[PDB]
Design an enzyme around this catalytic site. Structure first.
Site, PDB file in Angstrom:
ATOM      1  N   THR A   1      90.089  32.658  -4.090  1.00 25.49           N
ATOM      2  CA  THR A   1      91.477  33.038  -3.864  1.00 25.49           C
ATOM      3  C   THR A   1      91.701  34.504  -4.210  1.00 25.49           C
ATOM      4  O   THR A   1      92.802  34.897  -4.589  1.00 25.49           O
ATOM      5  CB  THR A   1      92.441  32.173  -4.691  1.00 25.49           C
ATOM      6  N   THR A   2      90.652  35.310  -4.078  1.00 20.97           N
ATOM      7  CA  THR A   2      90.736  36.721  -4.424  1.00 20.97           C
ATOM      8  C   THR A   2      91.502  37.485  -3.351  1.00 20.97           C
ATOM      9  O   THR A   2      91.191  37.379  -2.161  1.00 20.97           O
ATOM     10  CB  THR A   2      89.341  37.313  -4.598  1.00 20.97           C
TER      11      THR A   2
END
Lengths: 241, 244, 197, 212, 208, 203, 118, 241
Positions: free
Chosen positions: C1-2
């Site tokens: 989820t960067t």
């Protein structure tokens, strides 16, 4: 068409709304006011009919402010004028409260015009009787002027005049070159206009109130310093032969 | 409301006539001509050109803030005719309704739904004994991905319809007759042909010469669905190309 | 989820990773964690998976209405203010870390951040996400100033690919997209196209 | 979260024959640090009534700012001034208005009755007034009171006569009791602020107390 | 849950000085490193706040709106710092009583009518004035030096006040978990409000 | 929570015949206060309902359903089809889905026009489902599927149907503390209703 | 928090738990139309101006006071196309339809309460 | 006589264009007693007059109280006077409670005008009938603000709205030069002399028909009545002629 002129929600066989036209006519019997935009600014001026000398400067004024860079020159019933000024103040305040920067002039003028129109649609409240001017200034957009009629009109004018003495003011303003001028001679022109159209058999005391916003004040609305006002007063007085 | 409803057969909206006609809405229909304008919208086969009229009362008034051609959505227009103080409100109402529909169903509205919503919210004003039927002529424009271009018209009473050509204003009768005569001759059209037909109809109805900067034109095309307004150059070029 | 954004001269870039999950199990292998609000402003997402969607829908509604009302292209500061006002007012059950960026005709190129809690501020590079805490040193030590589109794209690819392997939440394809003065162009890095390290 | 915190203080009130005295130490302390050393805790209400409010210093200000407003309302309405016999009931009603969210204060009222007479009231956090003669209280209570009980109203003493309290004795007693009780308590000390009130107005008084 | 460090301040001979750290902490990580914490509400009053940052933004907007409205009206009157302090106290107390507290702690300083004002507005409804002040974790480290110097000398000048604030920044940067090398400052002397920054703090670790 | 009282109801579809049976007992946990407590309601003429569960909600749901059924019957003119009551009770139960009732009703009857037997069931909050062969619900739900699955048979005449519904209950409900001491059998053939009362262990 | 400053008509309702909300979907279901209208009014007032919420809400007030008396079911044919829920059937009309109210009050009492005289 | 159909209500415009109810209310406010409103550099005296229902009864109250730094008079209807002074007091108390400064007159009067502007528009309501002469010194010298039945307030230096007072206006205008530098006693003497012109001939000012009220620099607003007003009413020369 007498008979149908008793409520806003009632048309006429011709098709016109008579209460609106009555409100239109009811703004005429007042003082006069003009407003001109130069190349890089605007300016206004009102003939304040001074009553008995019991009052003083700073009395009931017709050059309110709505924000740091906008102002009006309303000329009509004063109570409705104050109500409209408060409404416009609230509108600009709300816009700046959450959208950042400051309201563009066109949006605020449209909102106020629609609000003042909202009353002439119902049989519960009377329409506002007052003219309304909303000249202002910007940094990149330029100098803009707007006039709002009591009912719905929100046109954009180069320079107009509102009040009783309006036809002569329009005719005299027609003969100017207000597209390549500055803010150091339009003031004198406004003074000479307000003294070339001013009745004296029914008016006795005068006190010119002037204000400009433009590059000379880098976007701020305020009353002219007394020196420039006095100089314009002297020039206008000496110009009448 | 502490003022009551004026007594009379034609003095209020909620009272029927002895024969059964709403006289107030008929007065509303008569009220459009009070302002004095003319608007013509013609749809061809791939374009939806709209022409109108512009009148400047004087010289001081600016020529850029008097337009009678607003924008509703990204690809829908309007040629509002009549009292300005009421069209200026119907336009905002239509914009809000369009935004709400796009939020609730997630695609651009077909013209029929917007027309129907406007007609219903205009009709609801003709039952309560507190309203005034605001007088306008809601003429729509736009293209559809299932039926092509469409032109719709609405009235203050609330009766909408679908027209292949429409004239609205103070000269509705003769303009409609001329369009009826012209349409029955030829069926195919094109962008240039439609623009020339609209300009010719306006000129032959008003019976006056058109200055290069007197009429604004807003169009939508299949290749360019985005609602765009013709500039001064294009209008002048078409006007000088006409009858040459 | 960067999620991360970088600003350069004349435009900005924007990347993401598609590994939305539900714990120890992968929910969707490939997704589009990059929503195109209006036509220039872009809005990434983090935190939960429903509050962010609702906030994005409301922002789209209000911003489209505003833009069509003023008949002018929107300004990114308006979008940032709208996101701030929506998020802060509901700071009890709206855990949604958001990052927005875009281009506007006036002072083009803007990167805004708005973490959980409703606070809003601008920075040259914005980073946000659960697996977005392992590249702070690398991005601080590598990000110089005065870079054009190509090296900015390469730097974003490398920086995101570094955290793409040292985390459990991240993994999969990469979704670089650059918004510039003219328009928006998108591309996806898959397979060996992703730099090793 | 916890919408309560302590701030210390001490209130003492002697109601003599024709004089009321309200005195209080001055130190805002919370946790283990000290915030200030002036922090007066003796506010005036009328020309013949003084209020002392100890306890948490977040409602000690709100009640002070509300009582004066209600007093102004009463004066404007009934065209008079509230006597010390009505402020007690009015403050009790205000305090009980929030019995389900109690105010954390310990108020003391001192003033003159209709005739020249001493009178000191006493409340509780929930709010219930009760007339007294020498009542004290506050954070560092339970130490101030017993000595006054020994001195003012002679108790557990025999073969001793009864003498009315003289004004010269009252300040001499109050200063001594505060000096004695400042050492063994933590929250007290710093400056002592005295608000002796008589039938000519309010005269004020400040002395040192275990300099810290 | 962004958090500040300390917004300490000391009074002064005709003026007030306030200092704060340009830091934002996400619990333990240093997420942001350029945010500001000093305000210029009007021509004679300044502001500083600690604790949460979003609430500081919200009160910034509200108070700036109020002051700009009052100035725009036009009467020859402004907001004295005492009124602003009272308004903040009332707002904080009302928010506390509604079970929706604003996790914030502010300092209000100003110079009007030839006198200085400085106050404390802690979220639990605490309000007072003092010759010196500190906020957050500085109430244990920052206060004692200022209190000692003020007790030794109750009146000062600009040079020693500035050096005292510099020394306090030095010690606080030495021995605090959340701190930054740079910090802002702003005096409120009768000329106006002059925000200054960023600054720096030269240190010495020779006892290593 | 369906243990503060007791109850058990079946339904078998035979050959133009439907049978519904219940158990008569009302007691506060271990204690017992009465032996006669009806759990079969005569809604319509050739239709029946079989509420079983917590009694204090059984009474209320029966009253409300009877009210609404009378309203619909009077307004719409002719009788109610058996499928309609299914959605009726589904809506009535979902009315308070968040504040759930405690009922597991069973509906069994005939079509007034076609005379085709119909049987359905319901869960706690309303989830319509129809089973052709049989259905059962109640406090002692576990100890009836085993008894019913083997003993069942398709295309049964009324006598064998009565025997099977008697044998699937009489010796299958005594294997539990609560919900015993009496069994009522309702057999609904094509032309006439018939009620019988069995005898079981008095314990 | 009010003191007394007929119990048969309104009784058997302890003060304990009305200031204690039930299952968290209580304030989002007892007051739903009001909250949705408030949100829409706030949005319009923020983005379009101060005229729209005033006009729309006063239209609501104008159309609200033409229905039948409170002790009978209200058709509410109008105000619906104006609200925007013209076809948005949901969990508001199929569950506990007010036409078949299980309990009903006295006519005079209900109308006098609707007038707000009490 | 073409006005019967256009004056029964307040939300209708005449063909000329003017609200007749406003004019009728402005005519109605002239029923009462005179009230001079002089001002100086340090003090703002407010002298009024009191009528008498009968010799047996007692007189009305014409000088109310608002706060420690502001005191209003009254003229006209006594019904709405209390209903409006309640709003006065409530606003002043709220401003003292929220902030910690006395509410300036310039905002209070604007708020009062804004409140009184509402009833003149909506149906089923009537304009107020008061003639307030709000006086008080807060921060920039004492002020004297007048209020009319219409929401149109004036700034002023000295005026006598109320009963028959045109002669009072003439006298107040004749001597409007010394009011800038005088002590309290001289200003009060001038006020009483100005009021004496209103009173008919062969009538003197007794002790029971004057309500001198003074607010200034270091003294709060105090009302004087009964024998307490005797020291001010000593010199007064001997007779107007």
């Amino acid at each position: 068409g007498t008979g149908y002129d008793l409520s806003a929600s009632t048309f006429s066989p011709d098709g016109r709304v008579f209460q609106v036209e009555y409100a239109m006519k009811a703004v005429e019997n007042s003082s006069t006011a003009i407003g001109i935009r130069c190349k890089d600014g605007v300016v206004f001026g009102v003939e304040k009919l001074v009553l008995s000398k019991l009052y003083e400067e700073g009395s009931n004024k017709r050059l309110f402010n709505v924000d740091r860079h906008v102002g009006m020159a309303v000329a009509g019933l004063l109570a409705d004028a104050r109500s409209l000024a408060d409404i416009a103040r609230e509108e600009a305040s709300n816009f700046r409260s959450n959208f950042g920067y400051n309201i563009p002039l066109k949006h605020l003028a449209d909102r106020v015009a629609m609000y003042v129109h909202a009353y002439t649609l119902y049989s519960a409240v009377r329409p506002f009787g007052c003219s309304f001017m909303l000249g202002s200034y910007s940094v990149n957009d330029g100098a803009q002027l707007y006039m709002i009629d009591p009912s719905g009109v929100s046109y954009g004018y180069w320079g107009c005049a509102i009040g009783k003495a309006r036809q002569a003011a329009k005719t005299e303003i027609e003969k100017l070159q207000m597209k390549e001028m500055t803010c150091r001679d339009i003031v004198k022109e406004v003074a000479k206009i307000i003294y070339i159209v001013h009745d004296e058999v029914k008016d006795k005391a005068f006190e010119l109130e002037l204000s400009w916003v433009g590059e000379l004040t880098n976007g701020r609305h305020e009353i002219v310093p007394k020196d420039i006002r006095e100089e314009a007063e002297k020039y206008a007085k000496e110009s009448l032969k | 409301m502490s003022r009551g409803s004026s007594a009379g057969f034609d003095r209020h909206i909620t009272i029927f006539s002895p024969e059964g006609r709403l006289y107030q809405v008929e007065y509303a229909f008569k009220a459009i001509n009070q302002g004095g304008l003319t608007s013509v919208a013609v749809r061809g086969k791939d374009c939806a050109v709209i022409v109108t009229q512009k009148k400047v009362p004087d010289k001081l008034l600016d020529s850029s803030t008097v337009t009678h051609l607003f924008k509703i959505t990204e690809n829908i227009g309007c040629v509002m005719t009549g009292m300005t103080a009421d069209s200026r409100s119907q336009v905002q109402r239509a914009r809000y309704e369009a935004a709400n529909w796009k939020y609730k169903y997630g695609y651009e509205i077909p013209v029929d739904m917007l027309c129907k919503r406007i007609a219903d919210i205009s009709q609801v004003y003709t039952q309560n004994a507190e309203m005034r039927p605001l007088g306008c002529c809601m003429i729509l424009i736009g293209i559809d991905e299932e039926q092509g271009p469409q032109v719709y018209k609405c009235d203050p009473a609330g009766y909408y319809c679908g027209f292949k050509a429409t004239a609205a204003g103070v000269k509705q009768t003769e303009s409609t007759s001329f369009l009826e005569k012209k349409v029955k001759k030829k069926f195919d059209w094109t962008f240039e042909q439609t623009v020339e037909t609209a300009i010719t109809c306006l000129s032959t109805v008003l019976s006056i010469d058109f200055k290069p900067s007197e009429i604004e034109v807003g169009v939508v095309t299949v290749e360019n669905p985005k609602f765009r307004i013709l500039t001064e150059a294009e209008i002048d070029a078409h006007l000088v190309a006409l009858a040459e | 989820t960067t999620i991360m954004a970088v600003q350069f001269d004349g435009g900005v870039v924007l990347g993401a990773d598609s590994r939305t999950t539900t714990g120890s199990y992968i929910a969707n292998r490939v997704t589009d964690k990059l929503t195109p609000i209006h036509d220039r402003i872009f809005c990434c997402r983090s935190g939960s998976a429903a509050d962010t969607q609702a906030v994005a829908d409301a922002v789209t509604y209000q911003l489209g209405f505003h833009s069509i009302e003023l008949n002018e292209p929107p300004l990114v500061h308006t979008a940032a203010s709208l996101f701030k006002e929506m998020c802060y007012r509901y700071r009890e059950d709206l855990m949604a870390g958001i990052i927005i960026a875009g281009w506007d005709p006036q002072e083009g190129g803007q990167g805004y951040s708005v973490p959980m809690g409703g606070m809003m501020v601008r920075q040259s590079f914005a980073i946000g996400g659960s697996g977005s805490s392992y590249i702070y040193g690398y991005v601080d030590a590598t990000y110089r100033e005065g870079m054009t589109k190509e090296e900015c794209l390469q730097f974003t690819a490398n920086a995101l690919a570094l955290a793409m392997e040292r985390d459990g939440s991240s993994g999969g394809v990469i979704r670089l997209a650059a918004i510039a003065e003219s328009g928006v162009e998108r591309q996806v890095l898959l397979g060996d196209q992703i730099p090793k390290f | 979260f916890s919408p309560y915190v302590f701030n210390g203080g001490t209130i003492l009130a002697i109601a003599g024959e024709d004089f009321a005295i309200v005195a209080s130490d001055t130190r805002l302390s919370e946790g283990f640090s000290i915030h200030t050393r002036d922090s007066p805790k003796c506010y005036k209400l009328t020309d013949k009534t003084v209020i002392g409010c100890s306890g948490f210093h977040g409602d000690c200000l709100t009640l002070t700012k509300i009582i004066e407003a209600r007093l102004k309302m009463y004066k404007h309405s009934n065209n008079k001034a509230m006597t010390t016999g009505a402020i007690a009931a009015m403050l009790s009603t205000i305090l009980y208005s929030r019995r389900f969210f109690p105010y954390y204060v310990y108020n003391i009222i001192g003033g003159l009755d209709e005739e020249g007479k001493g009178a000191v009231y006493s409340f509780d956090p929930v709010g219930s007034y009760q007339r007294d003669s020498f009542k004290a209280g506050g954070s560092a209570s339970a130490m101030l009171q017993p000595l006054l009980d020994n001195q003012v109203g002679f108790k557990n003493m025999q073969n001793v006569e009864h003498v009315p309290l003289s004004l010269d004795r009252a300040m001499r007693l109050v200063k001594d009791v505060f000096i004695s009780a400042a050492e063994r308590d933590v929250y007290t000390g710093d400056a002592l602020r005295i608000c002796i009130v008589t039938k000519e107005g309010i005269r004020e008084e400040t002395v040192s107390l275990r300099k810290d | 849950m962004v958090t500040g460090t300390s917004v300490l301040g000391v009074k002064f001979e005709g003026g007030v000085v306030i200092a704060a750290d340009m830091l934002g902490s996400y619990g333990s990580l240093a997420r942001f490193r350029n945010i500001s914490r000093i305000m210029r509400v009007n021509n004679s009053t300044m502001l500083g706040a600690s604790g949460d940052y979003a609430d500081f933004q919200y009160l910034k907007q509200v108070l700036g709106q109020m002051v700009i409205d009052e100035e725009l009206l036009g009467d020859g009157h402004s907001y004295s710092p005492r009124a602003i302090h009272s308004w903040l106290t009332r707002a904080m107390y009302s928010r506390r009583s509604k079970m929706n507290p604003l996790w914030n702690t502010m300092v209000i300083g100003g110079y009007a009518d030839g006198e200085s004002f400085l106050g404390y507005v802690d979220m639990l409804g605490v309000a007072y004035e003092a010759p010196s002040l500190a906020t957050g974790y500085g109430a244990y480290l920052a206060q004692p030096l200022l209190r000692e110097v003020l007790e030794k000398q109750p009146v000062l000048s600009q040079t020693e006040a500035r050096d005292l604030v510099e020394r306090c920044m030095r010690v606080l940067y030495y021995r605090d978990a959340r701190s930054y090398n740079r910090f802002q400052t702003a005096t409120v002397t009768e000329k106006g409000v002059e925000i200054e920054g960023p600054l720096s703090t030269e240190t010495n670790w020779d006892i290593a | 929570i369906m243990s503060y009282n007791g109850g058990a109801v079946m339904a078998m579809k035979g050959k133009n015949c439907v049978a519904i049976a219940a158990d008569r007992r009302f007691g506060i946990q271990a204690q017992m206060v009465t032996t006669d407590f009806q759990k079969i309601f005569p809604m319509g003429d050739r239709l029946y309902i079989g509420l079983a569960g917590l009694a204090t909600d059984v009474q209320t749901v029966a009253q409300r359903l009877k009210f609404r059924l009378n309203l619909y019957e009077l307004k719409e003119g002719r009788q109610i089809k058996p499928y309609t009551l299914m959605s009726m009770v589904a809506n009535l139960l979902y009315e308070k889905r968040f504040g759930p009732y405690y009922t597991e009703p069973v509906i069994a009857g005939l079509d007034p026009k076609t005379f085709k037997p119909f049987i359905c069931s319901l869960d706690l909050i309303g989830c319509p489902m129809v089973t052709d062969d049989f259905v059962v619900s109640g406090t002692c739900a576990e100890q009836m599927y085993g008894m019913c699955e083997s003993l069942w048979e398709p295309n049964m005449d009324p006598d064998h149907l009565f025997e099977t519904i008697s044998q699937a209950m009489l010796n299958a409900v005594d294997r539990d503390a609560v919900s015993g001491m009496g069994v009522i059998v309702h057999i609904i053939e094509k032309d006439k209703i018939t009620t019988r009362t069995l005898k079981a262990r008095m314990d | 928090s009010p003191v007394t400053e007929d119990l048969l008509r309104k009784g058997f309702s302890c003060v304990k738990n009305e200031l204690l909300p039930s299952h968290p979907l209580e304030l989002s279901e007892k007051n739903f139309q009001l909250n949705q209208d408030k949100m829409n009014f706030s949005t319009l007032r923020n983005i379009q101006g101060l005229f729209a919420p005033l006009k729309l809400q006063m239209e609501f007030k104008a159309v609200q006071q033409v229905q039948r008396l409170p002790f009978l079911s209200s058709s509410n044919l109008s105000l619906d196309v104006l609200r925007g829920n013209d076809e948005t059937i949901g969990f508001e009309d199929i569950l506990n339809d007010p036409s078949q109210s299980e309990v009903m009050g006295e006519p005079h009492l209900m109308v006098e309460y609707k007038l707000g005289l009490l | 006589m073409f006005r019967n159909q256009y004056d029964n209500d307040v939300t209708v415009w005449s063909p000329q264009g003017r609200i007749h109810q406003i004019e009728y209310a402005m005519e109605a406010v002239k029923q009462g007693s005179a009230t001079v409103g002089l001002k100086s550099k340090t003090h703002a005296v407010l002298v009024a007059l009191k009528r008498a229902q009968s010799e047996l009864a007692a007189h009305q109250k014409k000088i109310l109280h608002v706060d420690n730094h502001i005191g209003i008079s009254i003229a006209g209807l006594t019904a709405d006077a209390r209903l409006l002074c309640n709003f006065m007091r409530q606003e002043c108390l709220d401003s003292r409670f929220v902030f910690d400064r006395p509410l300036p007159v310039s905002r209070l009067v604007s708020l009062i005008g804004s409140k009184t502007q509402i009833p003149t528009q909506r149906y089923g309501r009537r304009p107020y009938g008061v003639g307030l002469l709000i006086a008080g010194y807060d921060d920039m010298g004492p002020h004297i603000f007048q209020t009319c039945p219409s929401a149109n307030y004036f700034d002023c230096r000295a005026m006598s709205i109320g009963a028959r007072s045109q002669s009072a206006r003439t006298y107040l205008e004749r001597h409007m030069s010394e009011f800038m530098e005088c002590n309290l006693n001289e200003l009060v003497k001038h006020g009483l002399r100005a009021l004496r012109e209103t009173l008919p001939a062969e009538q003197d000012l007794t002790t029971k028909n004057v309500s001198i009220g003074i607010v200034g620099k270091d003294l709060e607003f105090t009302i004087y009545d009964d024998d307490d007003v005797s020291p001010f009413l000593e010199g007064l020369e001997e007779r107007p002629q």
